[PDB]
Amino acid sequence: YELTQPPSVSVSPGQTARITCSGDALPKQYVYWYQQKPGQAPVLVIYKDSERPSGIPERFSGSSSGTTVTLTISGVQAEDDADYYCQAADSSNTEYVFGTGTKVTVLQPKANPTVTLFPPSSEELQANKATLVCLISDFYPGAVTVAWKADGSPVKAGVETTKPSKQSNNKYAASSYLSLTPEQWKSHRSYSCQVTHEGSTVEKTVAPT
Amino acid sequence: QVQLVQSGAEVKKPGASVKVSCKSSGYTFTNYIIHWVRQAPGQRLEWMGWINAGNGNTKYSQKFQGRISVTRDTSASAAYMELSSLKSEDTALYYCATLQMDYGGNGDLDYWGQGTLVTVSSASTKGPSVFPLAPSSKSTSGGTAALGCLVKDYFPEPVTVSWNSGALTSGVHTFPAVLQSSGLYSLSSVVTVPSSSLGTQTYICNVNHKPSNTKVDK
């Protein structure tokens, strides 16, 4: 038995954000709404379905109706981007369950095109016949996980390995994917024109063989 | 206030034994059940179970049986849980939960510890960073980094304070078996690229930053 809840929402700042948690055995139980900042332990934002603990601003509120409990945020702030969970119990009441988790976001990092910088082939990599170029994006808002290394040929799956989009400190997301290719393929290729796609844009960096 | 303390990061191979401690203080020790939960990276919180601070009787989650066994020491004021037969999906964060909210009622898991992170990884590193010519732009395409570094939480960066500023930490893409911790630290300067300080590679095996040679040599 697992509670259902939307996985993510996107509401511009200044507009109310609504999150729904549903369960068959819900009307006989209390929900606890938990706020978790990324890279931080969860923190209660709502308890007893109606009120918030001390130190929680008034912008959050909770309501219950039938089998659905709703968290409502009036005037969502910039710091509110986080993951929200609903905590309850099943019919037997001796098992504690958490919600799916809704990733609440406000409208959006600074948009920037993809930046590709192919690292130079290492001396050890060239000696080991594994010379390769790795492209890392400095910053990109909503960077897409698309990498297409094109060294004298079309995009090769084995040339570049996809990587998760890390969060940049400068109010953006930095994507760094390491691409591994053999030195013989790089030597055969005229130029290692590796292309990294991020932020709805594609940039290609070419280096000498 | 009520202080909750977890142990450090623990890394063992799958199928091994993992032991992690959770210590609590600052609340009336009559009855305050401490909850343990697990969190996979970028996933939902899954409830491992709960333990009694002083009572002793324990309940375990209906989904996980056998390998779960938590026994606390009331005199030691800490809770110890042992999990055997580690699986690949067990790589995750562990969190504790207790009560401080001042309007009464349990079932309100107030505080959470720092958590304990469990993974599986080998150790690896790299040598030279780059040997290219100096780029025209005032940026460093190649910086002190480790290629194919299976070491977890590797920190490849220049030993000296130079080239540290303006460097974006590279994510440890682990598509193959090796973690391949890139750890890119770009100097982001044409002058700094031509003369770059050696890049230390601590790696998982050595927590301290062991000196290593990695220069852009632009």
Three-state SS string over chain A comes to CCCECCCEEECCCCCCEEEEEECCCCCCCCCEEEEECCCCCCEEEEECCCECCCCCCCCEEEEEECCEEEEEECCCCHHHCEEEEEEEECCCCCCEEECCCEEEECCCCCCCCCCCCCCCCCHHHHHCCCCCCCEECCCECCCCCEEEEEECCCCCCCCCCCCCEEEECCCEEEEEECCCCCHHHHHHCCEEEEEEECCCCEEEECCEC
Alpha carbon dihedral A39, A45, A48, A50, in 10-degree steps, equals: -150
Q: Are residues A47 and A136 in the same domain?
A: no
Are β-strands B78-83 and A146-151 bridged in parallel, bridged antiparallel, or unpaired?
unpaired
Contacts of A32 in chain B (CB under 8 A): 107-109
Reported structure resolution in angstroms: 4.0
Position A113 in a domain: no
CA distance B35 to A15: 35
Of the candidates A181, A9, A187, the residue with the CA atom closest to the CA atom of residue A102: A9
Query: Is some CB atom of chain A closer than 8 A to the CB atom of B101?
Result: yes
Handedness of CA B173, B176, B180, B181 (dihedral sign): positive
Contact A140, A173 (CB under 8 A): yes
Position A1 in a domain: no
The answer for A 152-191 residues in CB contact with B (under 8 A) is 161-164, 166, 168, 174-178, 180
Q: Are residues A17 and A94 in the same domain?
A: yes
CA distance A69 to B180: 44
CA distance B83 to A154: 48
The structure tokens listed for B138 are 């005032």
Domain count, chain A: 2
Q: Are residues A171 and A198 in the same domain?
A: yes
Query: Is some CB atom of chain B closer than 8 A to the CB atom of A101?
Result: yes
Position A178 in a domain: yes
Contacts of B50 in chain A (CB under 8 A): 96
CATH of the domain at B61: 2.60.40.10
Return the number of CB contacts < 8 Å for A and B: 129
CA distance A187 to A133: 12
* Percent helix, percent strand, percent coil in chain B, to nearest 5: 0, 30, 70
CATH of the domain at A161: 2.60.40.10
Position A3 in a domain: no
Query: Is some CB atom of chain A closer than 8 A to the CB atom of B105?
Result: yes
Which among B45, B59, B139 has CB closest to A98? B45
What is the per-residue DSSP string for B182-208?
A: ---B----TTTTTS---EEE-TTT-SS
Q: Are residues A145 and A73 in the same domain?
A: no
CA angle B169, B173, B174 (to 5 degrees): 145
Of the candidates B58, B70, B74, B61, the residue with the CA atom closest to the CA atom of residue B20: B70
Contact A101, B44 (CB under 8 A): yes
The structure tokens listed for B172 are 């440890």
Position A48 in a domain: yes
Position A114 in a domain: no
Q: Are residues A21 and A96 in the same domain?
A: yes
Q: Are residues A98 and A144 in the same domain?
A: no
Task: Tell me the β-bridge partners of B199.
Answer: B158
Task: Tell me the β-bridge partners of B36.
Answer: B49, B96
Asked if B182 lies within 8 A of A176 by C-beta distance, the reply is yes
Task: Tell me the β-bridge partners of B177.
Answer: none
Q: How far apart are the first and last CA of chain B?
A: 55
The last residue of one of the domains, among A81, A106, A131, is: A106
Residue B59's H or E segment, with its range, is strand B59-60
Of the candidates A76, A90, A88, A85, the residue with the CA atom closest to the CA atom of residue A5: A85
CA distance A122 to A177: 17
The last residue of one of the domains, among A50, A73, A106, is: A106
Query: Is some CB atom of chain A closer than 8 A to the CB atom of B171?
Result: yes
The last residue of one of the domains, among A80, A106, A132, is: A106
Q: Are residues A145 and A91 in the same domain?
A: no
Which among B109, B112, B170 has CB closest to A176? B170
Distances (CA, A) of A61 to A5, A50, A68, A72: 17, 7, 14, 5
Distances (CA, A) of A116 to A201, B16, B106, B155, B170: 11, 41, 53, 22, 13
Residues in chain A: 209
Q: Are residues A160 and A135 in the same domain?
A: yes
Spatial CB neighbours of A121, under 8 Å, sequence gap ≥ 6:
A131, A132, A133, A183, A186, A207, B130, B131
Query: Is some CB atom of chain A closer than 8 A to the CB atom of B104?
Result: no
Contact B11, B35 (CB under 8 A): no
Q: Are residues A141 and A75 in the same domain?
A: no
Position A47 in a domain: yes
Contacts of A207 in chain B (CB under 8 A): 132, 141
Which among B142, B176, B180 has CB closest to A119? B142
Q: Are residues A42 and A127 in the same domain?
A: no
> Over the range B174-212, which residues count as b (16 or more CB within 10 Å of their CB) and which as e?
beeebbbbbbbbbbbbeebbbebbbbbbbbbeeeeeeeb
The answer for A 61-100 residues in CB contact with B (under 8 A) is 85, 87, 94-100
CA distance B132 to B129: 10
Of the candidates B171, B218, B209, the residue with the CA atom closest to the CA atom of residue B191: B218
Contact B126, B214 (CB under 8 A): yes
Which among A32, A95, A178 has CB closest to B147? A178
Which among B101, B126, B180 has CB closest to A122? B126
Q: What is the residue range of B23's domain?
A: 3-119
For chain A, give the residues followed by a break (C–N over 2.5 Å). Answer: 107
Q: Is B49 left (phi over 0), alpha (psi -120 to 50) or beta?
A: left
Contact B20, B26 (CB under 8 A): no
Q: Are residues A87 and A130 in the same domain?
A: no
* A103 → chain B, closest CA residue: B42
Position A140 in a domain: yes
Spatial CB neighbours of A173, under 8 Å, sequence gap ≥ 6:
A109, A139, A140, A141, A142, A143, A165, A166, A167
The structure tokens listed for A198 are 């991020």
Q: What is the residue range of A203's domain?
A: 123-208
